[PDB]
Amino acid sequence: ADLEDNMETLNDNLKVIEKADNAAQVKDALTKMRAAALDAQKATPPKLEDKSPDSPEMWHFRHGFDHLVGHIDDALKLANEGKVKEAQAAAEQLKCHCNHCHQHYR
Amino acid sequence: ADLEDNMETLNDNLKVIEKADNAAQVKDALTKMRAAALDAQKATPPKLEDKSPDSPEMWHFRHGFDHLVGHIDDALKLANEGKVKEAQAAAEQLKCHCNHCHQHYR
Lengths: 106, 106
Ligand code: HEC
Ligand code: HEC
Ligand SMILES: [Co+2]
Ligand SMILES: [Co+2]
Fold this sequence. Notes:
Two copies of one chain form a homodimer.
Chain A: H1 3-19, H2 23-40, H3 56-80, H4 84-93, H5 95-105
Helix pairs in contact in A: 1-2, 2-3, 3-4, 3-5
Bound molecules: heme C (2 copies) and cobalt (II) ion (CO) (2 copies).
PDB class: metal binding protein
Keywords: Metal selectivity, Irving-Williams series, metal binding protein
Assembly: dimeric
C-alpha cells in the first residue's frame, strides 16, 4: 500500500461507520482505519522531502498522524464497549483531523 | 477572567466572525479570541482538577491552546493581508479546535 491507498481506506471506512448500526461493524471499520493511518504515519511526504526531520513543518505533519491514530484508538475503545452511537460520533469527529492536515499540506 | 469567562469570549467572538457585518469585525474578534485562548491555557479544567500538571491530560489541554493560537495567527495574517473573506473562511475551521478539546475535557 502507498499513501493514496491508505487515504482511500480512511475515506471509505468513515462512510462504513456512518452506514453501520452495530458495534462489530464499527469496530471492523475503525480497525481498518487504524491500519491505514499507521501505514501512512512514518513516511516523509513529497512536499517535505527537503525539510529537516525535526523541522516544524515535518513535526506538525507527523503529529497529525499520531493524533489521528490516538483518536481512532479512542473510538475503537468505545466500539469495544458496545457504545455504537458514541463510537460513530467519535468517528465523525475524525474529519477535523483529515481536513486540518490537508489544509496545511496543500 | 476565569476559564468560563474565556470560553464565553471564544464562543461570542467565533460567532461574531460568522455574522460579521463588516470585514473589520473579523480581525477584532480574532484578536480577542487569541487572548482568551492564552488566558485559558493557564487554567485547570474541572474534569482535570485531580491530575498532575505534568499528566498527559494537562499537557494535551495546554497544547490545544497553542495549536488554536497558531491557527488564529494564520487567520489574523490573512486579515492583515486584506484577505478578509479567506480569514473568515479560516475562522470557521477553528470550530474543530473547540470540538476536539471539548470532547476530551469539557
Ligand atoms: C496528514 C497528517 C494527513 C491526515 C491526518 C490525513 N491525510 Fe488524507 N492526505 C494527506 C496527503 C499528504 C495526501 C496526498 C496529497 C494531497 O494533497 O492530496 C492526502 C490525500 C487524501 C485523499 C485523496 C485526495 C482527496 O480526495 O482529498 C483522500 C480521499 C484523503 N486524503 C482522505 C483522508 C481522510 C478521510 C482522513 C481522515 C480520516 C485523512 N485523509 C487524514 C495527508 C493526510
Ligand atoms: C482546550 C484546549 C479547549 C479549547 C481549544 C476550547 N475550549 Fe471551550 N472549554 C474547554 C473546557 C475544559 C471547558 C469546560 C469549562 C468548565 O469550567 O466547565 C470548556 C467550556 C466551554 C464552554 C462552556 C463554558 C461554560 O460556562 O460552561 C463554551 C461556550 C466553550 N468552551 C466554547 C469554546 C469555543 C467556541 C472554542 C473554540 C473557538 C473553545 N471553547 C475552545 C476547553 C477548551
Ligand atoms: Co486529542
Ligand atoms: Co495546525
